[PDB]
Design a protein around this ligand. Structure first.
Ligand SMILES: Cc1cc2nc3c(=O)[nH]c(=O)nc-3n(C[C@@H](O)[C@H](O)[C@H](O)COP(=O)(O)OP(=O)(O)OC[C@@H]3O[C@@H](n4cnc5c(N)ncnc54)[C@H](O)[C@H]3O)c2cc1C
Ligand SMILES: Cc1cc2nc3c(=O)[nH]c(=O)nc-3n(C[C@@H](O)[C@H](O)[C@H](O)COP(=O)(O)OP(=O)(O)OC[C@@H]3O[C@@H](n4cnc5c(N)ncnc54)[C@H](O)[C@H]3O)c2cc1C
Ligand code: PRO
Ligand code: PRO
Lengths: 478, 481
């Protein structure tokens, strides 16, 4: 089943739009106690919980598929992860689901240093490269991240001992209010070019933004969640993916909800408005269709919420967050390349390149190396706009070492139903707005990974929030 | 209300049996037909029961004790929760943290360690006559050093041989470590360890196993180590850092209240089971006093070390029988002491191998303003805390001789407890590789679920919840609707 989402390029086809996905639901409709808006992990979790608990639930989704900001496309026997990819057993909510759905043994490691070039390629200007062992890479990143995170003498353990409760130590607020650039400026004289370049590339990989617009405290939050170490981060952020792709995982939620007999759904159904009435809420599609339920779980992403009409009017904090928007404009490009030895390659090309961080991520059945490449707002490319330029950015990660057989990507920035990649905050945004983003709104429960407490911005945060939403609805409806 | 479980001692009152707990359920019964019977109201049974009742199943919970919680429960004594068994939790523990967050208790934790005032040192005792004192930074360094040597069997402290701890056979080299004892591993590195390194190492690993150096699986420790992030700090974070402000019984109550609130929960406490028999369309569960209960499926959460007391029909597999015969090795003695030294809030100690309590920390301050110490003993130098109060007081005092007097002791003897026969699961060499599949296996209409044979945080509160979640899933799949 082909989605409208996604792009693929090959020499023989050029650039084409729309790729297959297990996430595509057919037929698109099968038609209420609850309406759930959005079929990403947050909506899937809420819907699964609610239907299992006995509630008649209508899921309305703008796209032709489930998964939202995370979905996979199987092409020539290999799953390409268009958005959210990596998971770990230190991520409570996603791991709980993985184990309950018995997919704990269905993971693959992204890193494999068993053969090939077995090096990290650091490029700090367009004309040269520095190569080092993965051990040296580890040491370099450890050194730079130590200096970056050591605001309190314990790399964040003192100012942020309980990352689920950011104000537990009052002084954390000042780090939430700090930009990446402001922190770098404090340690600048203590960083070599190699340290600073790898550091900036890594922290911008995480934020998808710029040094000026990314919150230092939010990175400290990721760091803390991961165990306050570089290896903790690598383990949680980039180590383990589904063998069969994320869309296989999303299906499990879908199949369970569907099996209850209490699931109604409409795909290709973008909501334009949500109005609170007496004892119920009314949801209206762009095309005028109306749906009514006792409660609504709205999972529309933060960067998309300004397109919706709510009455009653949303709070001041909700509006300010929505209008400012989060900063992650990550470009994620998959390249299937003809260099077999690059399975064990990693690269940082910064700041001159429109893709700044990349890894060997797998081998396709055709025996080609799969590279996953990441770009941010500091030097941004829209991968769809000019494939020649996209290929150039890919190539410049390791000039003269490979030819590209395939590109696969989804443009999250230009996606009207995402308007950005995963949540990453501006300085001060989380401390100022998190409470407002999580607050009650009559018959509407606002739930999205964007404003979770723990693994905020992760698949895990989506599930945390969907679980909360279902709990709220169940308690309110008795 | 007062449980039959637990002990307390004060100079004024002497030793008394039975302590209060929010885990005590009154009235002890509210009673079919029954869709499911869940045997045991520990975290495994509570999770299964909550999931099942919420999913619409008429569920009967049968519990031997007068309380919920099983191997984890708290007693509030003069406003302080004493953790009788399972205590510590962390957000790197998937199943317990999921429950904590969903019940909105993520902000209801307290840190055990507080080094902001007081003696602020680690006291290492390797013989009865002297002590070595060091900073907690030096303590960290000592343990990091010793645990590095202990765990580095593969050059990466376990990451190569056990990359996926939920799948122990992923790498073939792991089985030989599961089959290795603590003593066999130490023998491979003995010449590389100072007395201080080996003493603190052996204390720490025996803290974890509750067993002996000879009967404790090295691979099982490597499993804990891996689950925790393959570092000493990961271990400390996951094993001993954060507890519930209001005690574990407050957490257990949340599961109870949700299950009860469905209107689909039947229950009987003080109802020990003697047999479970698979019949044609149902299973029959019979109590010690002869009462019979019938349901379509049974979730049996009776612990491994207690299973041999139960009569099953049909007979169990060789693997399940052999595990329940051999038994797990954790005979941990856990003793709380409310003490008169205020400065010991920031104290930690290891006294090894000469003391019957080996590992201890300052864990809190009671409302009365007294330091709370928690003390742990293993099977290499074991004490039954209820046998002789004076011997128990002696063991406590020898952790820091001449520094404090004891105002109160609080403990439960897990070893002699007929419904536990041991503390948390910890395996003999080769036991998990040989028996884990057997222990997890279907048995007609009976689902065997317990932390003792979980895949991830096996032996933890987390593992109990993992297993309870699996059990409800199996039942819902097999029964439908
Ligand atoms: C490129 C990229 C890489 C990532 N990498 C990782 C990773 O490695 N690991 C990880 O854990 N996470 C990763 N993330 C994070 C990510 O996957 C998300 O945070 C998570 O999936 C969000 O789930 P959600 O349900 O909360 O939101 P979404 O998934 O965005 O779901 C909500 C969505 O609501 C719908 N919607 C929007 N507007 C309307 C409307 N008007 N009407 C109806 N429906 C509407 C969307 O179409 C529907 O699917 C990544 C994300 C991206 C984009
Ligand atoms: C001293 C100690 C310290 C611990 N420390 C920690 C810790 O810090 N953190 C952590 O996560 N875990 C810790 N643990 C682990 C521990 O809490 C358990 O692994 C977990 O609680 C077990 O849950 P369970 O449900 O699987 O088993 P249990 O809790 O044992 O529950 C099963 C039980 O079934 C019942 N039963 C037994 N026989 C019968 C019968 N014949 N008929 C009816 N019912 C019967 C028991 O009474 C009932 O409660 C500790 C355990 C102990 C003892
Ligand atoms: O997949 C992505 O794009 C983000 C960035 C690195 C980890 N996850
Ligand atoms: O409470 C206990 O006894 C176990 C041993 C140390 C960590 N938790």
């Amino acid at each position: 089943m082909t989605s409208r989402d996604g792009y693929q390029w090959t020499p023989e086809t050029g650039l084409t739009q729309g790729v297959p996905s297990l996430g595509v639901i057919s037929p698109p409709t099968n038609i209420w106690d609850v309406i759930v808006i959005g079929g990403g992990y947050c909506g899937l979790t809420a819907t699964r919980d609610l239907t299992v608990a006995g509630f008649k639930t209508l899921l309305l989704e703008a796209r032709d598929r489930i998964g939202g900001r995370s979905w996979s496309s199987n092409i020539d026997g290999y799953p390409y992860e268009m958005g959210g990819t990596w998971v770990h057993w230190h991520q409570s909510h996603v791991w709980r689901e993985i184990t309950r759905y018995k997919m704990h043994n269905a993971l693959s490691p992204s890193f494999n240093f068993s053969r090939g070039v077995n090096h990290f390629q650091l490029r700090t200007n367009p004309t040269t490269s520095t190569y080092m062992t993965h051990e040296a890479e580890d040491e370099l990143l450890r050194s730079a991240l130590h200096k970056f995170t050591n605001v309190d003498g314990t790399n964040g353990r003192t100012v942020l001992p309980f990352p689920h409760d950011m104000f537990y130590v009052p002084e954390f607020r000042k780090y939430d209010e700090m930009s990446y650039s402001e922190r770098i400026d404090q340690i600048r004289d203590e960083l070599s070019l190699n340290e600073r370049s790898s550091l900036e590339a890594f922290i911008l990989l995480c934020s998808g933004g710029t040094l000026e617009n990314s919150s230092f405290g939010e990175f400290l939050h990721w760091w803390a969640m991961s165990g306050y170490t570089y290896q903790g981060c690598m383990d949680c952020l980039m180590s383990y993916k589904f063998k069969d792709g994320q869309s296989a995982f999303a299906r499990r939620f879908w199949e369970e909800a569907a099996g209850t007999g209490r699931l109604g759904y409409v795909f290709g159904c973008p909501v334009r408005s949500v109005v609170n009435e007496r004892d119920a809420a009314r949801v209206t599609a762009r095309d005028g269709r109306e749906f009514v339920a006792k409660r609504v779980v709205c999972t529309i992403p933060l960067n998309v919420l300004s397109t919706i009409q709510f009455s009653p009017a949303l709070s001041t904090e909700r509006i300010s967050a929505m209008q400012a928007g989060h900063v992650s404009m990550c470009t994620k490009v998959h390249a299937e390349v003809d260099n077999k030895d690059m399975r064990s390659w990693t690269g940082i090309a910064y700041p001159f390149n429109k893709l700044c961080y990349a890894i060997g991520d797998g081998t396709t059945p055709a025996g080609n190396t799969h590279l996953v490449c990441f770009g941010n707002s500091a030097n941004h490319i829209q991968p769809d706009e000019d494939v020649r330029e996209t290929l150039k950015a890919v190539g410049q990660l390791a000039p003269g070492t490979f030819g590209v057989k395939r590109l696969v990507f989804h443009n999250w920035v230009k996606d009207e139903f995402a308007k950005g990649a995963w949540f990453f905050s501006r300085p001060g945004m989380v401390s100022e707005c998190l409470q407002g983003l999580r607050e009650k709104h009559g018959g509407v429960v606002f739930a999205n990974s964007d404003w979770a407490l723990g693994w905020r911005s992760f698949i895990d945060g989506a599930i945390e929030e969907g679980t909360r939403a279902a709990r709220v609805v169940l308690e309110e409806l008795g």
